[PDB]
Amino acid sequence: VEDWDLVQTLGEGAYGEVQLAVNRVTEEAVAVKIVDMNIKKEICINKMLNHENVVKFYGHRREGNIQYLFLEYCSGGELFDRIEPDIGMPEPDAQRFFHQLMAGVVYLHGIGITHRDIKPENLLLDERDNLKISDFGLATVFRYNNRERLLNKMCGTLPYVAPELLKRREFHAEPVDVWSCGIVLTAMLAGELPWDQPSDSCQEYSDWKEKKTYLNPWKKIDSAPLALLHKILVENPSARITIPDIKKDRWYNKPLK
Ligand SMILES: CN(C)CC(C)(C)COc1ccc2[nH]c(-c3cc(NC(=O)c4cnn(Cc5ccccc5)c4)c[nH]c3=O)cc2c1
């Protein structure tokens, strides 16, 4: 029962690959992340995580240069692949995935962890299309012994990143994750990213601050989810909506399909 057949390749990453592995006896699947050993922290963070919208960590094995992490298998693949270019997806599915993303993110924040790289490539779908947050490689602790520390390393992926992280030496962790979730929502409902980065050097970002919502991607989005996006994609992180308030939003609580 301790033996696993590496069946299929799942994902190349920078540092590794991810293999479907199946158990010889039980036929259980796992995803196996394989790296030429950042990683100490990733394992350490994963060890603290236990939630239905976070990819389960099963364990690790040293093997000299090669680090193995054994991770929950999500047969649905990446949310990224459910987003049709230029269209997105049906609004009820976007809503359900967003509900689950917030559940995952609430959980992480409640234990003082920030993911710092939320995007569709990192949101996995299990067999019943349940969304799971993956890839704790950029994640870090922002609250410890009930004291918040401010972040100052710039980490993430530029189209998903909050504007305060390009402009401020220090910033709060939670609003940043909130922002990226908003860019994820936008992608789900429009099938495109609104900007390369949230700077006034990008015209699409200037246009959004000038409320030009008759332009794309905003014109493809119904008025109710767009009103939520108006509260999330707010340049000042202190005025940006918080998760407890997202859970009170009208579209968030709209019955759909
Ligand atoms: C492109 N596609 C049309 C090709 C096709 C093969 C159809 C992809 O379809 C699937 C289907 C199911 C999948 N499941 C997984 C998976 C991925 C992870 N990954 C992670 O948890 C993690 C942790 N860190 N990273 C990024 C990384 C990876 C390697 C090295 C460094 C960083 C990823 C954990 N569990 C999974 O189950 C990927 C995956 C892909």
Short mmCIF file of C-alpha atoms and ligand atoms in Angstrom, two decimals:
data_model
loop_
_atom_site.label_atom_id
_atom_site.label_comp_id
_atom_site.label_asym_id
_atom_site.label_seq_id
_atom_site.Cartn_x
_atom_site.Cartn_y
_atom_site.Cartn_z
CA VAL A 1 0.00 0.00 0.00
CA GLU A 2 3.03 2.39 0.38
CA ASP A 3 3.55 2.31 -3.50
CA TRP A 4 2.27 4.89 -6.02
CA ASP A 5 2.41 4.84 -9.77
CA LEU A 6 3.25 8.20 -11.34
CA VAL A 7 0.62 8.08 -14.07
CA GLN A 8 0.16 11.50 -15.75
CA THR A 9 1.87 14.88 -15.83
CA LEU A 10 -0.33 17.65 -14.50
CA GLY A 11 1.70 20.87 -14.35
CA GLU A 12 5.20 22.21 -15.05
CA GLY A 13 6.20 24.98 -12.58
CA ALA A 14 9.44 27.00 -12.18
CA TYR A 15 11.37 24.60 -9.90
CA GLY A 16 9.32 21.48 -10.80
CA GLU A 17 6.50 19.32 -12.12
CA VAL A 18 3.28 17.92 -10.71
CA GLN A 19 2.36 14.28 -11.34
CA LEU A 20 -0.79 12.36 -10.82
CA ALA A 21 0.16 9.41 -8.64
CA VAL A 22 -2.15 6.45 -7.98
CA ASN A 23 -1.90 3.93 -5.19
CA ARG A 24 -1.04 0.34 -6.36
CA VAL A 25 -3.46 -1.27 -3.85
CA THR A 26 -6.23 1.21 -3.00
CA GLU A 27 -6.24 3.07 -6.33
CA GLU A 28 -6.31 6.41 -4.43
CA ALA A 29 -4.96 9.39 -6.43
CA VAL A 30 -2.64 12.09 -5.23
CA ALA A 31 -0.91 14.97 -6.86
CA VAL A 32 2.83 14.85 -6.34
CA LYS A 33 4.85 18.02 -6.54
CA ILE A 34 8.51 17.35 -7.36
CA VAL A 35 11.26 20.01 -6.76
CA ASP A 36 15.17 20.29 -6.88
CA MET A 37 15.59 21.47 -3.23
CA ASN A 38 10.96 29.34 0.01
CA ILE A 39 10.19 25.55 0.10
CA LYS A 40 10.65 25.17 3.90
CA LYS A 41 8.09 27.91 4.36
CA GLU A 42 5.71 26.43 1.78
CA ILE A 43 5.73 23.06 3.55
CA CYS A 44 5.50 24.76 6.97
CA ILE A 45 2.51 26.88 5.85
CA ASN A 46 0.76 23.86 4.28
CA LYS A 47 1.15 21.92 7.50
CA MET A 48 -1.09 24.45 9.27
CA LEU A 49 -3.89 24.23 6.64
CA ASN A 50 -7.07 22.35 6.93
CA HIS A 51 -10.11 23.48 4.99
CA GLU A 52 -12.44 22.22 2.23
CA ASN A 53 -11.45 25.09 -0.17
CA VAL A 54 -7.71 24.70 0.35
CA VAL A 55 -5.75 21.91 -1.39
CA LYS A 56 -4.92 19.25 1.28
CA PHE A 57 -1.33 18.65 2.19
CA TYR A 58 -0.66 14.94 2.90
CA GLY A 59 3.09 15.11 3.65
CA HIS A 60 6.67 15.43 2.33
CA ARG A 61 9.87 13.36 1.74
CA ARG A 62 13.52 14.68 1.79
CA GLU A 63 15.31 12.29 -0.77
CA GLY A 64 18.55 14.37 -0.99
CA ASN A 65 18.13 17.00 -3.72
CA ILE A 66 14.50 16.10 -4.59
CA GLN A 67 11.66 17.47 -2.42
CA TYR A 68 8.27 15.71 -2.76
CA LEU A 69 5.02 17.24 -1.54
CA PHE A 70 1.96 15.04 -1.65
CA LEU A 71 -1.10 17.12 -2.29
CA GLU A 72 -4.78 16.71 -2.86
CA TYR A 73 -5.71 15.67 -6.39
CA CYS A 74 -8.29 17.94 -8.05
CA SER A 75 -9.48 16.15 -11.16
CA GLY A 76 -11.20 19.30 -12.49
CA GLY A 77 -7.88 21.04 -13.16
CA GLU A 78 -7.51 24.86 -13.07
CA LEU A 79 -10.26 27.38 -12.94
CA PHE A 80 -8.31 29.10 -15.59
CA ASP A 81 -9.56 26.52 -18.11
CA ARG A 82 -13.20 27.11 -17.31
CA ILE A 83 -12.90 30.73 -18.38
CA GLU A 84 -13.70 31.12 -22.09
CA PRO A 85 -11.68 33.88 -23.71
CA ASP A 86 -13.67 37.02 -24.15
CA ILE A 87 -16.82 35.51 -22.65
CA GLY A 88 -16.02 34.12 -19.20
CA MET A 89 -18.60 31.74 -17.86
CA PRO A 90 -22.23 31.61 -16.73
CA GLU A 91 -22.93 33.98 -13.89
CA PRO A 92 -24.22 31.26 -11.53
CA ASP A 93 -20.96 29.34 -11.86
CA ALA A 94 -18.91 32.48 -11.32
CA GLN A 95 -20.96 33.13 -8.19
CA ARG A 96 -20.48 29.72 -6.78
CA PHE A 97 -16.74 29.71 -7.46
CA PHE A 98 -16.44 33.19 -5.89
CA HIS A 99 -18.38 32.04 -2.73
CA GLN A 100 -15.89 29.23 -2.41
CA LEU A 101 -12.91 31.35 -3.06
CA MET A 102 -14.03 33.73 -0.25
CA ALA A 103 -14.55 30.75 2.08
CA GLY A 104 -10.96 29.67 1.44
CA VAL A 105 -9.59 33.17 1.78
CA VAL A 106 -11.60 33.88 5.00
CA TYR A 107 -10.06 30.71 6.45
CA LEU A 108 -6.49 31.67 5.55
CA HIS A 109 -6.84 35.15 6.84
CA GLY A 110 -8.43 33.92 10.05
CA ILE A 111 -5.27 31.91 10.73
CA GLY A 112 -3.07 34.89 9.84
CA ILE A 113 -1.94 33.65 6.42
CA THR A 114 -1.96 35.53 3.09
CA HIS A 115 -1.64 33.68 -0.17
CA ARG A 116 -0.36 36.64 -2.17
CA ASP A 117 -0.87 35.13 -5.61
CA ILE A 118 -4.49 34.42 -6.10
CA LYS A 119 -5.36 33.88 -9.77
CA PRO A 120 -7.23 31.28 -11.88
CA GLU A 121 -4.14 29.21 -12.55
CA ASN A 122 -3.97 28.58 -8.75
CA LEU A 123 -7.66 27.85 -8.07
CA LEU A 124 -8.25 24.11 -8.59
CA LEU A 125 -11.52 22.27 -9.19
CA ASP A 126 -12.21 18.89 -7.59
CA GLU A 127 -14.45 16.19 -9.01
CA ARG A 128 -17.66 18.00 -7.93
CA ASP A 129 -16.29 21.38 -9.20
CA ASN A 130 -15.42 22.52 -5.68
CA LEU A 131 -12.76 25.23 -5.79
CA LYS A 132 -9.56 24.80 -3.81
CA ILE A 133 -6.81 27.23 -3.31
CA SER A 134 -3.35 25.89 -4.24
CA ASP A 135 0.24 26.95 -4.32
CA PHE A 136 1.44 28.35 -1.05
CA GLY A 137 4.80 29.15 -2.47
CA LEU A 138 4.44 32.88 -2.13
CA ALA A 139 2.36 32.75 1.03
CA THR A 140 3.36 34.36 4.32
CA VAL A 141 2.29 35.08 7.86
CA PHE A 142 0.75 38.50 8.42
CA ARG A 143 -0.66 37.95 11.90
CA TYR A 144 1.08 36.20 14.79
CA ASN A 145 0.16 36.35 18.50
CA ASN A 146 -2.66 38.57 17.46
CA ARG A 147 -0.39 41.34 16.12
CA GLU A 148 -0.50 42.17 12.41
CA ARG A 149 2.69 42.74 10.54
CA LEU A 150 2.63 44.91 7.42
CA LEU A 151 4.09 43.55 4.26
CA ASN A 152 6.84 45.13 2.22
CA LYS A 153 8.14 42.55 -0.30
CA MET A 154 6.35 42.95 -3.67
CA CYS A 155 5.20 39.42 -4.64
CA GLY A 156 2.49 38.17 -7.01
CA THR A 157 1.42 38.47 -10.66
CA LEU A 158 1.07 41.95 -12.05
CA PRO A 159 -2.44 41.87 -13.59
CA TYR A 160 -3.80 40.52 -10.23
CA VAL A 161 -1.81 42.76 -7.91
CA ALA A 162 -3.28 45.63 -5.86
CA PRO A 163 -2.12 49.14 -6.66
CA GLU A 164 -0.74 49.83 -3.13
CA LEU A 165 1.84 47.20 -3.66
CA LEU A 166 3.35 49.10 -6.59
CA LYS A 167 3.20 52.49 -4.82
CA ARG A 168 3.76 52.03 -1.07
CA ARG A 169 6.71 50.78 0.86
CA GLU A 170 4.43 48.94 3.35
CA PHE A 171 0.84 47.77 3.12
CA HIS A 172 -1.71 45.56 4.83
CA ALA A 173 -1.92 41.91 3.63
CA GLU A 174 -5.67 41.32 3.56
CA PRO A 175 -6.84 44.07 1.15
CA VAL A 176 -4.30 42.79 -1.35
CA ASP A 177 -5.87 39.32 -1.40
CA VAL A 178 -9.26 40.99 -1.67
CA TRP A 179 -8.19 42.90 -4.80
CA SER A 180 -6.86 39.79 -6.60
CA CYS A 181 -10.15 38.03 -5.86
CA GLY A 182 -11.83 40.92 -7.59
CA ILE A 183 -9.61 40.55 -10.64
CA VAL A 184 -10.51 36.83 -10.56
CA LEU A 185 -14.20 37.68 -10.50
CA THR A 186 -13.73 40.05 -13.43
CA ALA A 187 -12.02 37.28 -15.41
CA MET A 188 -14.79 34.84 -14.63
CA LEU A 189 -17.50 37.18 -15.88
CA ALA A 190 -15.76 38.80 -18.87
CA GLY A 191 -13.19 36.31 -20.08
CA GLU A 192 -10.46 38.95 -19.99
CA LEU A 193 -8.18 40.88 -17.57
CA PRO A 194 -8.84 44.57 -17.38
CA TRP A 195 -5.19 45.73 -17.27
CA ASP A 196 -1.58 44.64 -17.38
CA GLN A 197 -1.11 46.35 -14.06
CA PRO A 198 -2.97 48.76 -11.81
CA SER A 199 -0.90 51.89 -12.57
CA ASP A 200 -1.83 55.19 -14.19
CA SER A 201 0.71 54.19 -16.91
CA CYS A 202 -2.08 51.71 -18.05
CA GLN A 203 -4.98 53.50 -19.81
CA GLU A 204 -7.50 50.78 -18.93
CA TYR A 205 -6.77 51.40 -15.21
CA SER A 206 -7.16 55.21 -15.65
CA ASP A 207 -10.43 54.59 -17.47
CA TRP A 208 -11.78 52.47 -14.64
CA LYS A 209 -11.02 55.16 -12.03
CA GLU A 210 -12.85 57.54 -14.35
CA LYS A 211 -15.84 55.12 -14.17
CA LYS A 212 -15.79 54.40 -17.95
CA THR A 213 -17.82 51.21 -17.63
CA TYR A 214 -19.36 51.37 -21.12
CA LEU A 215 -15.86 50.03 -22.09
CA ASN A 216 -14.69 46.38 -21.90
CA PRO A 217 -14.42 44.32 -19.82
CA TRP A 218 -16.98 46.19 -17.69
CA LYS A 219 -19.64 46.41 -20.43
CA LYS A 220 -19.95 42.61 -20.51
CA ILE A 221 -20.75 42.48 -16.80
CA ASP A 222 -24.19 42.80 -15.29
CA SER A 223 -24.94 45.74 -13.12
CA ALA A 224 -25.12 43.83 -9.79
CA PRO A 225 -21.75 41.99 -9.94
CA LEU A 226 -20.23 45.17 -11.39
CA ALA A 227 -21.40 47.05 -8.31
CA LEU A 228 -19.52 44.54 -6.16
CA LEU A 229 -16.47 45.01 -8.39
CA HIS A 230 -16.82 48.80 -7.87
CA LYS A 231 -16.32 48.17 -4.12
CA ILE A 232 -13.47 45.69 -4.47
CA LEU A 233 -11.42 47.44 -7.04
CA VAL A 234 -10.94 50.59 -5.02
CA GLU A 235 -7.46 52.13 -5.21
CA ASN A 236 -7.18 53.09 -1.54
CA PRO A 237 -6.85 49.86 0.41
CA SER A 238 -8.37 51.54 3.49
CA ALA A 239 -11.53 52.29 1.65
CA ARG A 240 -11.62 48.92 -0.18
CA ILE A 241 -14.47 46.59 0.87
CA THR A 242 -13.61 43.89 3.41
CA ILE A 243 -14.66 40.27 3.21
CA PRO A 244 -17.36 40.55 5.94
CA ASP A 245 -18.91 43.28 3.79
CA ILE A 246 -18.53 41.30 0.57
CA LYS A 247 -20.68 38.66 2.23
CA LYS A 248 -23.39 41.31 2.61
CA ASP A 249 -23.27 42.49 -1.04
CA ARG A 250 -26.41 42.20 -3.09
CA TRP A 251 -25.01 40.10 -5.96
CA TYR A 252 -23.15 37.96 -3.50
CA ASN A 253 -26.51 37.02 -1.89
CA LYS A 254 -28.51 36.81 -5.17
CA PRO A 255 -30.11 33.37 -5.87
CA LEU A 256 -28.82 32.34 -9.38
CA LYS A 257 -29.92 30.01 -12.35
C1 LIG B 1 -3.25 22.32 -19.23
N1 LIG B 1 -4.24 21.22 -19.19
C2 LIG B 1 -5.28 21.36 -20.24
C3 LIG B 1 -3.58 19.90 -19.19
C4 LIG B 1 -4.24 18.97 -18.16
C5 LIG B 1 -3.32 17.78 -17.82
C6 LIG B 1 -5.63 18.49 -18.67
C7 LIG B 1 -4.37 19.78 -16.89
O1 LIG B 1 -5.50 19.18 -16.24
C8 LIG B 1 -5.30 19.08 -14.90
C9 LIG B 1 -6.23 18.31 -14.23
C10 LIG B 1 -6.12 18.15 -12.86
C11 LIG B 1 -5.09 18.79 -12.19
N2 LIG B 1 -4.78 18.78 -10.92
C12 LIG B 1 -3.66 19.52 -10.72
C13 LIG B 1 -3.11 19.72 -9.46
C14 LIG B 1 -2.15 20.68 -9.21
C15 LIG B 1 -1.67 20.89 -7.91
N3 LIG B 1 -0.71 21.82 -7.69
C16 LIG B 1 -0.37 22.43 -6.50
O2 LIG B 1 -0.91 22.18 -5.41
C17 LIG B 1 0.85 23.35 -6.51
C18 LIG B 1 1.66 23.71 -5.47
N4 LIG B 1 2.64 24.53 -5.98
N5 LIG B 1 2.40 24.61 -7.41
C19 LIG B 1 3.09 25.32 -8.49
C20 LIG B 1 4.45 24.67 -8.71
C21 LIG B 1 4.51 23.40 -9.34
C22 LIG B 1 5.74 22.76 -9.55
C23 LIG B 1 6.91 23.40 -9.12
C24 LIG B 1 6.86 24.67 -8.49
C25 LIG B 1 5.63 25.30 -8.29
C26 LIG B 1 1.30 23.90 -7.66
C27 LIG B 1 -2.17 20.11 -6.89
N6 LIG B 1 -3.17 19.16 -7.11
C28 LIG B 1 -3.61 18.95 -8.40
O3 LIG B 1 -4.48 18.06 -8.57
C29 LIG B 1 -3.30 20.02 -11.91
C30 LIG B 1 -4.15 19.57 -12.85
C31 LIG B 1 -4.25 19.72 -14.23
#
